[PDB]
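Internal ticket #5521
Category: modeling
Description: The requester needs a full-assembly model to guide mutagenesis choices. All entity lines are attached below as received. Residue total reported by intake: 432.
Assigned to: D.W.
Attached entities:
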Amino acid sequence: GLDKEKINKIIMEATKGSRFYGNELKKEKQVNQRIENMMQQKAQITSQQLRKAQLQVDRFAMELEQSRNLSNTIVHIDMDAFYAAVEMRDNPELKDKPIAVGSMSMLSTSNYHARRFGVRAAMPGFIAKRLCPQLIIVPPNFDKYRAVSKEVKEILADYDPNFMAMSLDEAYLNITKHLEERQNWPEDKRRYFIKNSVVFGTSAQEVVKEIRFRIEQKTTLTASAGIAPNTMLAKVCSDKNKPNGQYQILPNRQAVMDFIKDLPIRKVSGIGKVTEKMLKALGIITCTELYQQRALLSLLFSETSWHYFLHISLGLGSTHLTRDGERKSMSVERTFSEINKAEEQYSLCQELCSELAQDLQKERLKGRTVTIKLKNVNFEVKTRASTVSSVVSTAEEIFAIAKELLKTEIDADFPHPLRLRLMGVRISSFPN
DNA sequence: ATACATACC
DNA sequence: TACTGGTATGTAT
Ligand SMILES: Nc1ncnc2c1ncn2[C@H]1C[C@H](O)[C@@H](COP(=O)(O)NP(=O)(O)OP(=O)(O)O)O1
Ligand SMILES: [Mg+2]
Ligand SMILES: [Mg+2]
Ligand SMILES: [Mg+2]
């Protein structure tokens, strides 16, 4: 498959000049400035501050290190090319062919064949077709994916009944308890037939082989898996042998540190495009560099960020799955071809409010904060929020609040019309 | 509390 | 022709 410059070449040539690209520059500059600002303060940092922080951080680091929990076994399962794999399963014509699930405007994912051409999730179809004109863009069938998801979630329930579904295709499992019961199971209880039988051992490696086997037998789709003593690690491992493979970080401190040693921080869940580029500008790329700079980082970043970075640098993370409690927000948003007539924008706001009210009606939810989201034709995004004393829920009450927030924004630019491409409404601040 | 940014599927 | 929908969290004021 294609190189890796030829790709970015095509994307640039196709993106450059678009209102969309304009905005991406506007953001990258707003980030570069944020780096430059950080960069200053690093210069104004003294050696006797550095020493002061270093003795503080290490005091906290000894507290984390002494509390390290290796006694749990955490599994992250992540379906392989989920949507695309499903559409491949049920249409032989795509057998050995590059595909992507989505529209010509936007793609959800792509199969590994198509990923060799640099077509990826969150790419517009029309750009992906320039990277690979044989690409088959198959429309998404959300409802199938939900149904397939339910089939695997049923299997996963056997090993951890409190497993944490992150989305349709992925989940964390705490198999610690299952491995204890399984230690002294007969071959009967861990024997599965092929769709002539097969058997799996008593170890963690084997349990996960059984899970991934049953998943393939039930759904005709492969999954990858990661094993570790915490979620943060397990999530990373699950990606290591993708597609259709496992990895284990064994529950001993040395192994953890061996894995961490040269791990690019980007691979950790929650270090993205920006934090990478920010941490790179301090010379931090691996998770040991992140450890080494821990004093400096305590001065340049907020408490939560450097606390989080320290957990990353020590190979720490969550060692029990907290059963997802109540939601914090519900929202709906929609992109469209340009709208500028005020009366059409009110109507469209009123529609979204109705849809949100209907989704609230499902889970019997009422909130206090209504937040409209507007994104003009140049991709610039405004949110405007208003909190109310008493909780609201109906399409009328939500619209009443959103109406004004929108009105204000139409008035502000007056006599210029709001030229928007996306509107949304969110409700939040639900009671405890 | 409000705004905007960053991240994940 | 065409650049998503969605929830939670962070950063800053
Ligand atoms: N940015 C995005 N926008 C829309 N849909 C997306 C998306 N990212 C993912 N999806 C959809 C499409 C995906 O099928 C599904 C699961 O997301 P993953 O597990 O992150 N990606 P996959 O399973 O395809 O491949 P593998 O894990 O082997 O790399 O969510
Ligand atoms: Mg995934
Ligand atoms: Mg996946
Ligand atoms: Mg990351």
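Resolution: model delivered.
Comment from assignee: Residues 118 and 387 of chain A are 44 Å apart (CA to CA).
Ticket closed.
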